[PDB]
């Protein structure tokens, strides 16, 4: 809004909004720039990057864990409470999913994310 | 039941291996829902298939048995199967039409003064008879009649006849087709390949029939097609009464109601002026016709081969142009009967597709376009011109339908801005917006659309204020371009 | 009604609350008369689309 | 009903997906109450829209169908929609005016001695006809007539005519516009881009008409606009009788009574002296005119594009200057027809807006100012000069009205110092003072006003001693400045 | 089928019309009732739009109703089915026989 | 339940419910997806995973430590308090079991787990 | 329109390759906004260019 800052974020997979915990991460897909020095400082150098979305889901919810561990081609939407939205298409569930005391960690990853709306 | 087995009982219990040999080369009956095609054709006498009933054909021998040997439909099915063995083939026979079965006569006269051979090309089939020194025309006519009777695939029957007070050498052969229609007439040539000539002293001539025949009605056949989606249709009958019904049915299927897209491929044989007049007359965006003059083979064979090649190529990719694909087994016309560059360009401007002849003897597709030329108010319109446009539009519609029916089987509609929260299975116009954007990304990655920012800015999703259960969306895609013309200028320095 | 709405059966709450009316019967003296109106949720049936190609 | 659907019934019950293809690129009908604009234009024959009636236009095809193809209003609507697709567009047609439909003739003579091409630019539209060796002027005239008849968007009709005892090569084409008015005349050029030339031996000339036409009356149209707030108005008719009525209506709306602010954007085409005279003559603070000389395209296209760009930019932000925004699709005049620096500066001092040409072929806005030049007593006045000032004043008035009508729907007035205590819904001049201070803080944070202490010290809120229900407030804001001139001095040492 | 659907005006009976069915009608009725009962017991608000009938042979290609026939049947109080891309038969939309208001007008309720 | 979330988890071995501490982990058996980048981002790549159950058991309980260190072919059942159940068959006790101040850590592991009930 | 083509129609639809030979060695008409130059010179008889026009 006029002075509103981002306090919470919403993550939606295939239209189902996920019961996400506090502290949800988001890494846009782009170019990672490194540093080059020889006898002096010369410039930077690029490296491709992949979009990542991280969150935590309580256990026993509407969405089962077997469904979570079987996501290969899904649509992930990351929306901030202020109104900023990013869309991830053909995403997949990466890393090892674990149910640690009712906490399930999602590492939903995609090869390209664009800022819609 | 996919493979039809002969002399092998279906109830066998001895554990062993059963091996059978069969000369006919059948085609696997694997279902191809996205490559269903339909063919229209006539069936001669001794046919075992009921008229106006579609039947699945998977081998040339089966088609010949069902529709009779030498029939139009059997030859068309064989030509289709000799070039496309992956698409589902459906053939529906027709009636008999009006007219006469006579197609002309071949007149032979004179005596041969040297050893040689006489080669006659009837309906594109080579027929060679040995010629001895001193042989008369009557003996050559008898040998030709025997050779024609030997060949069972000729859609003509030959009888010998000699009369009048002329010399005994003269004797003409009367030809009669196996079916009645506008395509019953055939072409007769005596020298097609190089190094072939008529023996000296032998005079050969061909006199065509004077009457005109009419194509059979297709109303019953078009009514009995069914409700399946035939993506490609082969129509050999190039006459106004039949094409009007075909256009009506296709445009009824093309609408948003039926959603069963269909395309028709035809080939017209005649002079340049007739082809131009026909192309100018027809103004449909669902039929593509290719013009050819002086074709040794009948038109429907070319139509079947072209439809098979185009169907396979467009099923592999709906956006790749049809620029250099070749037609296997189709004889090109003579050197003096091929259209020049100006004629081909005018035909392309007149809604008639054009072909080309390879460096060898192969005939290749040049560019495939539809009959659509004129806007509704009468102006020129480049839309709906290339067949690639129609194929891409059909594929996009099918993909959108599949995505919507899969991702959202059965949901509940709510207005934008409402607070529904987690858990509920409701859908917001923003959700459909995002899903359409993702599908557009998939389309662009697949190589069908080019511009994304314009598509996103032109999107608009909203609910209907009257139905309350219908969501209205208006989108515009930017279909990608094709590489057709390569213009170059060379500035030599010498 | 809140439970019904959360279960995914009814949509509008304010209208339902404003149309509610609970009263006693002036004859039975043991019967309570209530008149309520729910707004049954809609179903997604028709998806109408229009494609404007540029080629 | 926002999306107009074709061939899709409104009463459908089969649960499925309905997809339709339509070539026309419509615009979403999302309401934009703060971006309502109105356009004035003429409509030719074969029109289906009643005159002096506003209609909402959301696509170029709809405008062409309603006002006839090639009409002024249809072209203006298409130009507006090709650059602004977010603002509400309302178009009201006009009558026919007085004058003659003839606009001039194109004379062609001579014979071509070499191969080439003849390019003619009529009303900014490129028309190319191939020229062969030995071709005569009459054949080229016939080809040009055929090409013009092919183009449906030209607001001219062409007929061929040959007479007199001159050579058969000479043949002139007569042009007649599709509507009558002061803007019916068009411009004809034969070489606009580089690398284009007339084939050798061909003589081309253009003779304009001698008569003068008059713009149609707008009294009925201006009376039938309605009561909505049209923030921006497009007026192509640059004549005193129409502009007087427009000024009267706008200044009646600009007053504190109507409070329906409106602005008018016009473009005048002519010589430098005529533009200067017009700018000096007009002294209104609600109309902005941009002068151009030797424009290949008609003036109203430039007016529509400029109004669309300005409306979008000012709706995004009322204080950002219009310094580098470009006009898409508008061809700049020739190199020798562009104003120099001194001419542009004099035009800016004379109340005429100026444009600029980008490093490429793009035309960009340079500075937009109003016609207001002279104080009431006759002195110079820099107030009401920049369009940003009017936009900011209108936005401030709207914001103040909204804040007052929202925070205080219906209250009770009491004098300052009275003891009303908690609970009562009364308002004191100190309350309005504080609310105005808070609104001023919001304005300053938004980037519209600069100085706060002076505004607070100049505020004064008091009750009326006669009405007893009216509160009188006198405030003065300090509108923020814009970055226009960057003066630099470089002192090299070499 | 159209005449029967127009004749009956009850809001407690739903009938599905089929022409040229190789199997007897009661088999289709039993399968459809089982599928509908399970689906509605799982959720009473989810539409019956794409559920398939297992083991039921669809009619011939020339005996299936067109789009106009299906729409008219839906307007006449007769439920309609559909044939999957393969040989499966699927429910299309299930509606009741109720068509007419008490005074004779049209009524979308029930 | 209607709004019930997972607060505790129960682990049962051969029918005997284990005296488990707070914070019990569970990793389902499936495919672990990695990330592939060369000159650009191309996609993911799979890797097999094995089911794991982790918990802590107080010392001196009904089940002795010698029994715990001798589990080669057992049945492990992981059930959440809400009702989600996973079954591990032919499981085994992995890693080093230690009795640290009355705490015994179990790393019960299996090659495949399916969600029953 | 950067390259001036001779005897090649602008409306061609046959998909093929069109090759032409021309003795004159033209220069590409790529715009160079930072390298615009002007030349003054006299023109003799039989000229086809209007005077005082760049």
Curated annotation (Swiss-Prot), chains A, F:
Coiled-coil ranges (or none): none
InterPro entries linked to this entry: Phage_Mu_GpM_tail_tub (IPR019596)
Loss of function: phenotype: No tail is synthesized.
Subcellular location(s) of the protein: Virion; Host cytoplasm
Segments crossing the lipid bilayer: none
Keywords tagged on the record: Host cytoplasm, Late protein, Viral contractile tail ejection system, Viral genome ejection through host cell envelope, Viral penetration into host cytoplasm, Viral tail protein, Viral tail tube protein, Virion, Virus entry into host cell
GO CC list: host cell cytoplasm; virus tail, tube
Function summary: Polymerizes to make up the central tail tube that is surrounded by the tail sheath protein (TSP). Tail tube protein polymerization takes place around the tape measure protein (TMP) and is probably directed by chaperone proteins. Upon binding to host cell, the tail sheath contracts and the tail tube penetrates the host envelope. The tail tube is involved in viral genome delivery during ejection.
Subunit relationships: Homomultimer.
This protein's name: Tail tube protein
Native source organism of the sequence: Escherichia phage Mu (Bacteriophage Mu)
Swiss-Prot record, chain E:
Compartments where found: Virion; Host cytoplasm
Major location category of this protein: virion
Induction / repression: Expressed in the late phase of the viral replicative cycle. Expression of late genes is activated by the viral late transcription activator C.
BP term (GO), one: symbiont genome ejection through host cell envelope, contractile tail mechanism
Effect of disrupting the coding gene: No tail is synthesized.
Transmembrane helix found in the keyword field: no
Entry keyword annotation includes Ribonucleoprotein: no
Cellular component terms per the entry's GO annotation: host cell cytoplasm; virus tail, sheath
UniProt keyword list: Host cytoplasm, Late protein, Viral contractile tail ejection system, Viral genome ejection through host cell envelope, Viral penetration into host cytoplasm, Viral tail protein, Viral tail sheath protein, Virion, Virus entry into host cell
Record's function text: Polymerizes as an extended helical structure around the baseplate-tail tube complex. During ejection, the sheath shifts to a contracted form, thereby making the inner tail tube protrude through the host cell envelope.
Family statement: Belongs to the myoviridae tail sheath protein family.
Subunit structure: Homomultimer.
Descriptive protein name: Tail sheath protein
Species of origin: Escherichia phage Mu
Complete-protein stretch covered: 276 to 385 of 495
From Swiss-Prot, chain G:
Role noted for this protein: Polymerizes as an extended helical structure around the baseplate-tail tube complex. During ejection, the sheath shifts to a contracted form, thereby making the inner tail tube protrude through the host cell envelope.
Shown chain mapped onto the complete sequence: 2 to 55 of 495
Protein name: Tail sheath protein
Disruption phenotype annotation: No tail is synthesized.
Taxonomic superkingdom: Viruses
Organism this protein belongs to: Escherichia phage Mu
Induction cue: Expressed in the late phase of the viral replicative cycle. Expression of late genes is activated by the viral late transcription activator C.
Oligomer and partners: Homomultimer.
Location in the cell: Virion; Host cytoplasm
Family indicated by similarity: Belongs to the myoviridae tail sheath protein family.
């Amino acid at each position: 809004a006029g002075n509103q800052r981002q306090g919470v974020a919403f993550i939606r997979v295939n239209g189902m909004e996920l019961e996400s915990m506090e502290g949800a991460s988001f890494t846009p897909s782009g170019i990672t720039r490194e540093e080059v020095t020889g006898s002096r400082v010369y410039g930077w150098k690029g490296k491709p990057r992949a979009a990542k979305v991280e969150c935590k889901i309580p256990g026993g919810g509407p969405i089962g864990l077997d469904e979570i561990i079987d996501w290969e081609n899904i649509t992930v939407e990351f929306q901030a409470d202020t109104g900023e939205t990013w869309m991830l298409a053909n995403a997949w569930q990466a890393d090892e999913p674990k149910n640690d005391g009712g906490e399930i960690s999602l590492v939903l990853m995609a090869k390209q994310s664009k800022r819609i709306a | 039941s996919d493979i039809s087995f002969n002399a092998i009982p279906s109830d066998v219990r001895v554990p062993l291996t059963y091996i059978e040999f069969d000369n006919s080369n059948a085609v696997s009956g694997t279902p191809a829902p996205r490559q269903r095609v339909l063919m229209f054709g006539q069936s001669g006498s001794k046919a075992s298939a009921a008229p106006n009933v579609p039947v699945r054909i998977r081998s040339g021998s089966q088609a010949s048995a069902a529709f009779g040997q030498g029939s139009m439909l059997a030859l068309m099915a064989d030509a289709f199967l000799n070039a496309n063995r992956v698409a589902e083939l459906w053939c529906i026979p027709q009636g008999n039409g009006t007219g006469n079965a006579a197609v002309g006569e071949i007149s032979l006269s004179g005596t041969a003064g040297e050893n040689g051979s006489l080669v006659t090309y009837i309906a594109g089939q080579r027929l060679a008879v040995s010629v001895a020194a001193g042989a008369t025309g009557a003996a050559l006519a008898d040998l030709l009649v025997a050779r024609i009777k030997g060949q069972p695939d000729l859609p003509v029957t030959a009888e010998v006849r000699a009369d009048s007070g002329d010399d005994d050498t003269h004797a003409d052969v009367v030809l009669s087709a196996k079916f009645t229609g506008a395509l019953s007439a055939v072409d007769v040539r005596w020298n097609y390949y190089a190094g072939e000539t008529t023996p000296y002293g032998i005079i050969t001539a061909f006199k065509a029939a004077s009457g005109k025949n009419g194509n059979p009605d297709i109303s019953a056949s078009i009514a009995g097609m069914g409700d399946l989606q035939y993506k490609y249709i082969v129509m050999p009958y190039t006459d106004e009464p039949n094409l009007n019904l075909l256009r009506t049915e296709l445009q009824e299927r093309w609408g948003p109601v039926n959603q069963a897209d269909g395309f028709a491929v035809t080939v017209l044989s005649g002079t340049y002026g007739d082809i131009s007049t026909f192309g100018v007359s027809r103004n449909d965006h669902l039929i593509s016709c290719m013009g050819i003059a002086g074709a040794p083979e009948p038109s429907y064979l070319y139509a079947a081969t072209l439809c098979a090649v185009a169907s396979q190529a467009l099923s592999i990719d709906p956006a790749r142009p049809l620029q250099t694909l070749t037609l296997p087994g189709r004889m090109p016309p003579a050197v003096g009967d091929r259209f020049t560059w100006s004629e081909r360009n005018a035909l392309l401007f007149d809604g008639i597709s054009t072909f080309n002849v390879n460096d060898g003897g192969e005939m290749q597709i040049e560019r495939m376009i539809t009959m659509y030329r004129t806007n509704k108010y009468g102006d020129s319109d480049p839309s709906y011109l290339n067949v690639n446009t129609i194929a891409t539009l059909s594929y996009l519609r099918y993909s959108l339908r599949t995505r919507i029916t899969q991702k959202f089987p059965n949901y509940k509609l709510a207005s934008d801005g409402t607070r529904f929260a987690t858990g509920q299975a409701v859908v917001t116009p923003s959700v459909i917006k995002t899903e359409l954007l993702a599908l557009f990304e998939e389309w662009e990655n697949a190589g069908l659309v080019e511009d994304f920012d314009t598509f996103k800015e032109e999107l608009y999703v909203a609910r209907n204020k009257d139905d309350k259960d219908r969501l209205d969306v208006l989108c515009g895609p930017n279909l990608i371009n094709q590489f057709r013309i390569f213009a170059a200028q060379v500035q030599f320095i010498l």
